Structure formats: C-alpha cells, structure tokens
C-alpha cells in the first residue's frame, strides 16, 4: 500500500489520485442478508443488489440530464423531490460499500467532470440547487474524506511495519557485532 500512487516521470509526481479506491485491506464484518421466506432473531430480507446499483447510477444520469435540460415540469413535481431521494439511495449504497471502483467511477465524475483521471458537461455542484439537496452532497464529500483518511492510515501502517522491521534488524546487528566482542 503506497502513500501516493505510483509516480511516473520521476521528479514530477505527487498527483493526489482519486478517493474511494478498493485497495484498502481493513477489517469489517460481512452483511449477512437472508432470503425473504415471508414467514408469518431473523435477518433482513434479500434483494438482488446489482440491479439496484445499475438502476441508481443510471437514473442518476437521467436525472442530471433532466436537470441540465431545465424542463418546466420536474420528475416529482419539484427539483428537490426529484433530486433528494435518489441521492439518499446512492449515499446509502456507498456507505454500505457495495459500489466498486468502476461504480464509484462516473459517480464521482457526475459530482465534478472537469478534474478527473487523464494522461461540455455540467456537474451537480455547478448547477443551482434549491437547498436540502446540498446536505446529501456534503454527506457524500464527508464519505470521500473518510475514504482518504482510511487510505492514509493503511499507508502509514504499512510503512511503519517495514521501517520497524528494518530497524529491528539494525538493532540486532548493532548488539551482535561490537559490545559482546568485549574489547574491554
């Protein structure tokens, strides 16, 4: 696990990289879903998640296109009614951790298209918002900052382990040679 991504061009380096990368190897328990036996303690009912994950990111693109078209009639009757619940579902799915690297990709781009991976489009941040849609965006940004902090923690731990192993070997070398020899 590396602090900065693998740096090309030598001295010119230190690109921040995109947050929400699955390279982290933390320790969290599984979800343990259960089928909806609909019996009439027990665990949550099971739904296929992949169809929802596609349906959310898809309808997200459809909603951002509808917002960019500036239609006189909204999807739900108001712009906040069409923007809040899909963002809530996307935030919940991102917190639960099902979304992969490709799934976090283009969601992060729908947040902001201008800066992102490379050697028009209107982002959700740039368009005017009626308020109470902004809170979910702030929650998403807080999630991304938490991902960045977690990546920093893992890189620090890995470097710490390798440095302490090298210094343990150095201390063993220092005590072995010299001292014992007992030149007196």
């Amino acid at each position: 696990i590396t602090l900065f991504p693998p740096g090309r061009k030598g001295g010119n380096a230190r690109r921040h990289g995109l947050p929400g990368v699955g390279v982290t190897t933390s320790l969290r328990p599984p979800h343990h879903f259960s089928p909806p036996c609909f019996v009439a303690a027990r665990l949550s009912p099971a739904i296929p998640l992949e169809a929802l994950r596609d349906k959310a990111l898809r309808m997200l693109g459809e909603a951002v296109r509808d917002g960019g078209q500036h239609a006189r009639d909204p999807v739900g009757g108001s712009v906040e009614f069409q923007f809040v619940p899909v963002l809530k579902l996307v935030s919940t799915l991102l917190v639960m951790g099902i979304f992969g690297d490709e799934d976090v990709k283009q969601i992060l781009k729908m947040i902001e298209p201008e800066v992102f991976t490379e050697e028009l489009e209107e982002g959700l941040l740039q368009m005017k918002l009626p308020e109470s849609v902004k809170l979910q965006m702030c929650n998403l940004l807080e999630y991304f900052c938490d991902q960045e902090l977690q990546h920093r923690v893992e890189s620090l731990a890995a470097f710490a382990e390798r440095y302490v192993d090298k210094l343990q070997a150095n201390q063993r070398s220092r005590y072995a040679l010299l001292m014992r020899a007992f030149t007196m």
Binding site: L27, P29, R152, V153, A160
Partner: peptide, 26 residues
C-alpha cells in the same frame, strides 16, 4: 484529524483474524 484518529488505529498479527471477526460481530 489524523492526530486525533491515530489512538483508534490498531495493528494485529495475521492468522488470528477470524477471532477478531467474531469479536467485531459480537
């Protein structure tokens, strides 16, 4: 924030992670 979050960080040895999963689930 990294300074405040570092007391929560802990490092554990391999081959003992299953019992840590049991502890986390409990």
């Amino acid at each position: 924030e990294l300074l405040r979050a570092l007391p929560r960080a802990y490092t554990i040895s391999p081959s003992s992670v299953e019992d840590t999963m049991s502890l986390l689930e409990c």
